Amino acid sequence: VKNFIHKLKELKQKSLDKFANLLYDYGGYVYDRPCTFIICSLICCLLLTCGFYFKEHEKDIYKLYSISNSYAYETNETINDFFYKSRRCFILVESNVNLLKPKILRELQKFEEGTKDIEVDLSEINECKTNSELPPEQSHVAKELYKTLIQRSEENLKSGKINGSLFDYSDLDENGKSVNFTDYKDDVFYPYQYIPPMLIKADRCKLQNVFGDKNLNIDLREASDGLKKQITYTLEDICEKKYGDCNFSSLFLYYEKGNGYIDYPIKVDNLDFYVNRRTYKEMMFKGILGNMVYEKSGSKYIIKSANAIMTVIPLLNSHTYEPYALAYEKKLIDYVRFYNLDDIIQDEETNDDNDPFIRFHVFTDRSLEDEVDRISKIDNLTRLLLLIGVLLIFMYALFNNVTSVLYRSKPLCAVMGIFCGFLGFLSGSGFLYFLGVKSVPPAETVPFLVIGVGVDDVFVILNSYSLLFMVKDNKKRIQMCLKDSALAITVTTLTNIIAFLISAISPFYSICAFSLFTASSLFFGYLMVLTFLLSFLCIEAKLEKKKRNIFTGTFHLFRENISIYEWIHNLYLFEESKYIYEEPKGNIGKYFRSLVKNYYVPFLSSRFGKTIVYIMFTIIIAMSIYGCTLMKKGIKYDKAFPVDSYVRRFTTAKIKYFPDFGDFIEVYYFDKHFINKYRGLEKQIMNSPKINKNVHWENTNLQEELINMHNTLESQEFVTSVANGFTFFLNKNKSSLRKENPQEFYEIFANWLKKDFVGNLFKNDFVFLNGKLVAWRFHYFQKNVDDSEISSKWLKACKQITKLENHNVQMVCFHLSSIFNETDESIIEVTLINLGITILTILVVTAYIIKGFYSCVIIALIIFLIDLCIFGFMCLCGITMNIISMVILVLSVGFSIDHTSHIVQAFSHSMGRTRDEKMKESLHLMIGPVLHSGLSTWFVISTLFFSNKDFTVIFFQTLSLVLFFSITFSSMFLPVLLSSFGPLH
Ligand SMILES: CC(C)CCC[C@@H](C)[C@H]1CC[C@H]2[C@@H]3CC=C4C[C@@H](O)CC[C@]4(C)[C@H]3CC[C@]12C
Ligand SMILES: *[C@@H]1O[C@H](CO)[C@@H](O)[C@H](O)[C@H]1NC(C)=O
Ligand SMILES: *[C@@H]1O[C@H](CO)[C@@H](O)[C@H](O)[C@H]1NC(C)=O
Questions:
Q1: Domain layout of the chain by residue ranges
Q2: Relative to the CA of 165, which ligand 2 atom is closest?
Q3: Which of 512, 515, 520, 517 is nearest to 500 (CA)?
Q4: What atom in ligand 2 is closest to the CA of residue 747?
Q5: How far is the CA of 958 from the centre of ligand 3 (A)?
Q6: CB environment 254-286: b (16+ within 10 A), e (fewer)
Q7: Which membrane topology describes this protein?
Q8: Residue 238: DSSP 8-state
Q9: 756: CA distance to ligand 1 center in Å?
Q10: Residue closest by Cα to atom 10 of ligand 1
Q11: C-alpha–C-alpha distance, residues 474 and 476, integer Å
């Protein structure tokens, strides 16, 4: 075993060496034929760039920023498959004046009516393109049933008789039972006007299906564009209709039918649920108007001021009407966003002591996805930010690669060093595009980072070259240089790539892509450095030999071997006691080094210095610990969208003027049997099999639990208001419900829904199959709150309230934010797992390149300590541990390992007798590269700080912390730690 270990250590070294020797020779080849390498590398890069032609973006927010658990998603599916939801467009008008003033009001009125005026031509409908693929045929049985149901629906509706006598109310079997079609046949749904949405799949291409009055019977997919242009539909055609009239929620409902008059003040009996008597249509003034100012007279309030008026337009959500709806919404959003009434408000007084203003915000279902498209493209701002960053790093590079002796200085390399990285980004991206990898919104930051990381290798190479001033034959110098820095530049990259790849495994596609693209970019960039940049180094080197400055060479063109460690050691020894030990004036890094040797190192060596260092880092870690205590997770999905987004702006306004009406949480109940049955025709709660298998809704106690639940949820502070029809029904006619007869229950509830005014309002929240309430629902408003954590807290509580365990009844609380927030729960662990894998993998790699084992252990300690610091301080800075932040933390390992490793490897390879000696040598030889690498990266990413997109700024903040601690520890703590307890001999 000992012999085996010996042989192994022999292999590692031997191999590590061989690799170096190989690069040593490769350099020679490039040195002799620099042009060939540059031209070929560039052309090859271009080809990859061509790949961009196939660049396909990804715009499904859910895939981009959600686990896609297939659970909450499944919930949406179930909800949509059986319950008819309704597309709702929200239009809010905000101002600093009393929009209630008659003159303004009248204008606002036309604004509203304008919506109805909006008209969409058929040609606009993209879905029903003049040439498309007909949707897959709906299962035959499904078709049959749809035919049957639609037929009986009419029949029943005509009859109007609600009779449950025939319905068998026997408890269903485990199979839900108590010839597929026959089974699905003979099913009476109530309300009769309901047919399971899933079964509703008729080709919407035939206009006859969607809009009947048209009487056209014209297939849009088979119609001329001009012909389609001819036909035009309006909101009324695709709007939910109350009492045969679009069910808007505008204030103007009050004035309808002369119930009230714009010119006169608004006086209503109840601000909560006033009803226009003439129209018999109800309205919630509190919901419609914001910042209301009302008086009280004869029990009738006198609304006399409001600086916000919101109108909700309800549009059908049926599959058939889906394509058409989207079209109208698009027209609507444009219309509202550009509508302006500044003229009327010009002289009207303000309450904000600011210029009279009026703004029309609008939010439709298509809004979110549309905004995703906007975030998909590369904002000009981002572009600009990149440019600034590139300039910064360009300046920094040059400012460090230029000197008094121009021919000695190597500006060319620096310049191309930057490009090298960029070209890498393009080439890599193109390669991935070729592979089909879709781009993501977070990819905007990829260029920024890639460039920064790449330029770092440039510094390293140059450092080796410069420190090899002794060498006379340039070819040899370049060769030796590359040989010296080969392992370093290779490992550094390898580590980075590895980390990103490991991260790519993330479920969230955004992270996956961002990482994948970055990793590929880094890879190709490295290749470019070994080719392009190296070739440029060769050219400049050759010029230096001739002492020909770049410009000089241009006009003109138009017309031994010693370990650097050995040398540096000898230098110090010699110092302790010539040309070899005197860097030529203008060596690329001559100054900085001198500064480090004559100032920084002395300080570090100083006991007082050390004292300071240790204490400083001490407190740093301490602060980090407290930071961890203040750890908060989660970020609102909307944050993704730029703040400027009208969506974001809309939400803000709503919150400001309508705080109570925040999240419209919706709770649903879905009999497992019913769901399963119909789900079948179209070939967590599931925890317990009998969770919702069979519920006797006639059980008075159960009924009582229901009303109690309503009361409980109402009590909850976060809940602002609830609308549970069942409660209304139970309270309305509990006496009749006293007798617990299943059939009786069905009939009573059915009639209640059919007749009672309130009941009619809740007609679409209850569905009965064969006399049994297979599914139902109720909704409640949850006050708006920013913290994702507290939000989830509230929702989770709601779930508890909605779980009649005694009667085996568990209802599902649903909200859009649910899926996104759901991810927050597991973010804490997944990160640990990923980080762990990364750390390990990276450590293993370093171990194979770090000579001493003890040095490896030192590195690990440093890495972990940094990570604690970067995490602790992110929490301390308030950076929530969101997806964006976490990935950066996990990825941080790569950056940190690089800087730490360089110093460590040097200290080990030092020939210094005393530990301190080694430290000084290591620092004098690698401190420059380390500093340059980190700083360069930060400079490029600095501009991201001014990015509108929230996720971007988080990226900047987190990475800035990473880089900071990395460089800090690598340049300060690590040195002193090694100087005190470092591997010796
Ligand atoms: C005795 C009665 C008249 C008092 C007032 C009852 C009101 C507050 C009840 C009865 C009908 C209920 C409405 C029924 C339908 C809907 C549409 C749904 O998408 C949101 C909730 C909402 C808007 C309900 C809100 C609360 C509601 C308006
Ligand atoms: C329901 O139908 C059955 C069978 O036709 C009949 O006997 C009973 O009287 C009906 N009850 C009603 C009309 O509610
Ligand atoms: C019923 O369920 C599905 C859909 O028709 C099918 O796979 C199965 O064979 C059917 N069986 C019968 C009895 O029709």
A1: 18-54+378-634+822-981, 86-125+232-373, 655-821
A2: 1
A3: 515
A4: 14
A5: 55
A6: bbbeebbebeeebbbeebeebbbeebebebebb
A7: Multi-pass membrane protein
A8: G
A9: 13
A10: 758
A11: 5
